Design a protein around this ligand. Structure first.
Ligand SMILES: *[C@@H]1O[C@H](CO)[C@@H](O[C@@H]2O[C@H](CO)[C@@H](O)[C@H](O)[C@H]2NC(C)=O)[C@H](O)[C@H]1NC(C)=O
Lengths: 231, 628
């Protein structure tokens, strides 16, 4: 899992931190609505499974048949691509804001399609650690983020960051994971490997200079996640 | 012998109290109140085309124009941006709801396709300003066959706002007809995330809408809605069937999860309160006479003495519902009766089960025909087998077993319709703060009362005698009631103590009222703190039985304040000269002795505490002759 040499920058684009920029994120995906347009983004957790956020969807039981995933690309409008439909959905437990997704057929990996390492159960991310966040102009835009404690961010978030969450410190640039970018992953590099520690969820105020950003904590619900696939 | 004094003749509810208020400008259309962190607070009071922000003393600090549409004044309309913004007309305020998490206040009226409006709250030292509005209607996402941002119906709507995760969810119910559902519809039921960029409401969401055929007859009112436990609940008033008479209303309770944005669990329960007057009137089917139309309701936690009744535990939430008769009957006008929450659920759970399991009572009804398609349990709407790809429990349903109760007040309320309720929990006891149509406030304990109501207060709100508005709100220890073009602030512990006309009732008052007896009147300490005392109280002699004896004689003294909670041990009686104590009203027997048309005096001294208050003193009656 969770290894790119690919984007020659993995530990070299920690220079262009102050700002949001274009770049590569292979594990990030793009959930495609019944009509055709992109509506939310995902995270390749296995060849069959796409972990993403509950808010992307209205109801956990709406017919999916038609809803599709688009792994392979950068752009959101060329056979450097894949197009796998969604067969079903599995609504994570009350408060996870999580949604796994079985695909009509297991995907094939390469340079710009790759799995990401799920973390240990309940493993907490140290402040200071470096994580990244892709998003959608017409192209992907990775951006590198500093991790901060639930102590630190509950100050600015006015004591409202529950135990099953995390925050990154605010980019000084007016840029951050907001509308249509939810469900996209929040990969963190540890022991020489990128590891899915969060999921872009709605924030109160988003892409706001010097303001934190909250994500739902994945390690907090992985025992659920494995159980969902294993069987 | 012995007469009887009616438990009134102590209450005098004709005494008027002035109690601070706030002139509107016109008839009040809604209100809602803030109680922020830094002990900050406001009171927001709407009218036709204006919005009134009030301080914590009903003083209008900021007012703001909410209409008319198509007219260069109303800020809300102008904040929608470069026009046109129409059609033109008056903006009547159907929603006034605040989102505690931002914080922010909402306001949605019957102009402008029912769009809402946000008002980031701007603090002050125990005061709050509303920073300029921000139109909740995205240009490029909305359309006449799909307007996600259409929250407000002109036909009355309710909204409960809920925090899930890190964004705010809007559970939403609206009445609809042809002229509403036709196009740019608000849609009966829906759950909607508010977009973090204030531009409005995320599109998509599944929502429910009374189907095209039944837009005309089957109109649903939405009387009240709330959040408690892990559920948004929605309180209704609608026809009992799709094919039965459209004039056959009946209240239901519709539920949805408070953590799970989907209508897949749209449960609906039929509430059903009735009057039970011993005799049982003519056209009624035993049990009681049905009051099937709810006129207001309020959920709240209950006291010790009420939990016991109702068979529940102190603290538990209990919906309360103020039911009136079908149409306008002829009996009492209003019946209030408690539904506890847990038990509304536990019915609906066993409501669910019986509809979805191995053996299924063949000939049940998932129902709600008016919303979705008919279909027999367990299989979903229209379809005739339950294909295992989907479930049963992930479809909307109507729990057939209704929920039945009996008025908490055995019809004592009486003839003047109750219009507004706010139940609180003043210390260990509990109290209902009723408002009437004849323009009056009824603060009355909420114990299942058999023969009379335990009055705290009954008095007229101001002078213009007008019905008290349904939606009643609260600040610290001060409820807000509304009637006509005015808003009144009633203290939770009832304004005065000057209706209790007797040291009797007066010192039986439930502590919090502050009631003490100041000699020849009752009242708080303020009103006479030279002689205000809350402990002792003197016996009142009313009459006696043998009114002229010979020079033995079994006198029976008849009065009040004779007993402890009989008494005996020690009380003097001087019926012209010695007698002798020998073992509503409180009677007694006194064998007397010779002398060696006089009065008849009784005197209690060195007497132990009563539960509420202590008996000591003398009262003297005339009219007892001597015979030889
Ligand atoms: C609250 O008190 C008022 C004051 O009397 C009541 O209004 C009267 O109602 C009686 C019957 O209850 C009528 O016959 C009177 O003529 C009414 N007159 C006036 C001037 O009010 C009202 O009934 C009381 N309500 C409660 C719950 O006690």
């Amino acid at each position: 899992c969770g290894k790119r040499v690919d984007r020659l920058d993995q530990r070299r684009s920690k220079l262009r931190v102050v700002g949001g920029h274009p770049g590569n994120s292979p594990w990030t995906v793009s959930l495609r609505n019944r009509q055709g347009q992109h509506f939310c983004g995902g995270s390749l957790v296995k060849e069959q499974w796409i972990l993403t956020a509950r808010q992307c969807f209205s109801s956990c039981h709406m017919p999916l048949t038609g809803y599709e995933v688009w792994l392979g690309t950068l752009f959101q409008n060329e056979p450097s691509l894949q197009r796998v439909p969604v067969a079903k959905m599995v609504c994570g437990p009350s408060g996870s804001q999580l949604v796994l997704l079985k695909l009509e057929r297991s995907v094939t990996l390469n340079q710009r399609v790759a799995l990401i390492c799920l973390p240990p159960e309940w493993y907490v991310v140290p402040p200071g650690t470096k994580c990244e966040i892709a998003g959608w102009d017409t192209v992907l835009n990775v951006a590198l983020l500093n991790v901060i404690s639930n102590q630190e961010c509950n100050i600015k978030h006015r004591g409202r960051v529950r135990e099953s969450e995390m925050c990154t410190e605010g980019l000084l640039a007016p840029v951050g994971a907001c509308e249509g970018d939810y469900g996209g992953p929040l990969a963190c590099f540890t022991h020489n490997s990128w590891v899915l520690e969060g999921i872009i969820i709605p924030n109160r105020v988003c892409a706001r200079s010097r303001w934190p950003a909250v994500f739902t904590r994945v390690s907090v619900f992985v025992d659920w996640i494995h159980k969902v696939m294993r069987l | 012998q012995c007469p009887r004094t009616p438990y009134a003749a102590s209450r005098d509810f004709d005494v008027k109290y002035v109690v601070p208020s706030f002139s509107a400008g016109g008839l009040v259309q809604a209100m809602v109140t803030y109680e922020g962190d830094r002990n900050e607070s406001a009171v927001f009071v709407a009218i036709r085309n204006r919005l009134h922000v009030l301080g914590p003393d009903l003083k209008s600090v900021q007012s703001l124009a909410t209409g008319p549409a198509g007219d260069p004044g109303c800020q809300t309309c102008a904040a929608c941006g470069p026009g046109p913004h129409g059609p033109p007309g008056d903006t009547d305020t159907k929603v006034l709801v605040l989102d505690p998490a931002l914080p922010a206040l909402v306001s949605c009226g019957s102009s402008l396709q029912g769009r809402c409006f946000l008002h980031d709250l701007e603090p002050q030292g125990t005061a709050v300003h509303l920073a300029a509005p921000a139109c909740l209607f995205s240009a490029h996402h909305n359309r006449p066959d799909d307007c996600p941002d259409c929250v407000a119906s002109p036909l009355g709507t309710r909204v409960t706002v809920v925090e899930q995760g890190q964004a705010s969810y809007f559970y939403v119910a609206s009445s609809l007809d042809a002229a509403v559902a036709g196009s740019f519809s608000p849609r009966s039921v829906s759950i909607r995330r508010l977009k973090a960029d204030a531009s409005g409401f995320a599109p998509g969401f599944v929502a429910l809408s009374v189907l095209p055929k039944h837009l005309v007859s089957y109109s649903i009112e939405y009387v009240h809605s709330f959040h408690t436990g892990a559920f948004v609940y929605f309180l209704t008033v609608q026809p009992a069937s799709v094919t039965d008479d459209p004039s056959a209303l009946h209240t239901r309770l519709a539920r949805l999860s408070a953590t799970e944005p989907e209508l897949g669990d749209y449960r609906e329960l039929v509430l059903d309160c009735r009057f039970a007057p011993k005799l049982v009137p003519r056209g009624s089917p035993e049990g009681g006479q049905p009051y099937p139309v709810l006129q207001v309701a309020h959920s709240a936690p209950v006291g010790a003495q009420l939990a016991t009744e109702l068979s529940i535990a102190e603290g538990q939430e209990v919906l309360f519902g103020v039911f009136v008769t079908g149409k306008d009957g002829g009996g009492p006008n209003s019946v209030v009766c408690a539904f506890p929450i847990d038990l509304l659920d536990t019915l609906i759970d066993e409501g669910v089960e019986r509809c979805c399991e191995s053996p299924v009572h063949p000939g049940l009804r998932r129902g709600l025909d008016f919303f979705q398609s008919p279909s027999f349990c367990p299989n979903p709407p229209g379809l005739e087998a339950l294909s295992p790809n989907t479930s049963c429990r992930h479809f909307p349903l109507l729990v057939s077993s209704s929920f039945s109760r009996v008025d908490l007040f055995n019809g004592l309320l009486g003839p003047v319709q109750v219009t507004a309720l706010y139940v609180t929990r003043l210390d260990n006891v509990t109290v209902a703060h009723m408002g009437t149509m004849d323009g009056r406030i009824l603060q009355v304990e909420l114990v299942r009362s058999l023969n009379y109501l335990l009055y705290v207060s009954n008095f007229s709100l101001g002078d213009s005698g007008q019905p008290v508005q349904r939606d009643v709100s609260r600040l610290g220890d001060h409820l807000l009631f509304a009637s006509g073009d005015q808003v009144f602030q009633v203290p939770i512990q009832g304004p005065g103590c000057r209706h209790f006309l007797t040291c009797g009732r007066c010192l039986r008052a439930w502590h919090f009222m502050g009631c003490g007896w100041c000699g020849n009147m009752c009242g708080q300490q303020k009103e006479c703190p030279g002689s205000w005392q809350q402990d002792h109280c003197p016996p009142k002699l009313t009459e006696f039985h043998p009114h002229s004896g010979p020079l033995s004689t079994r006198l029976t003294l008849c009065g009040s304040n004779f007993y402890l909670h009989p008494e005996g041990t020690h009380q003097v009686t001087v019926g012209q000269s010695p007698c002798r104590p020998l073992p509503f009203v409180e009677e007694f027997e006194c064998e007397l002795e010779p002398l060696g048309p006089t009065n008849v005096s009784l005197t209690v001294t060195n007497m132990p505490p009563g539960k509420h208050f202590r008996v000591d003193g003398t009262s003297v009656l005339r009219g007892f002759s001597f015979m030889e």
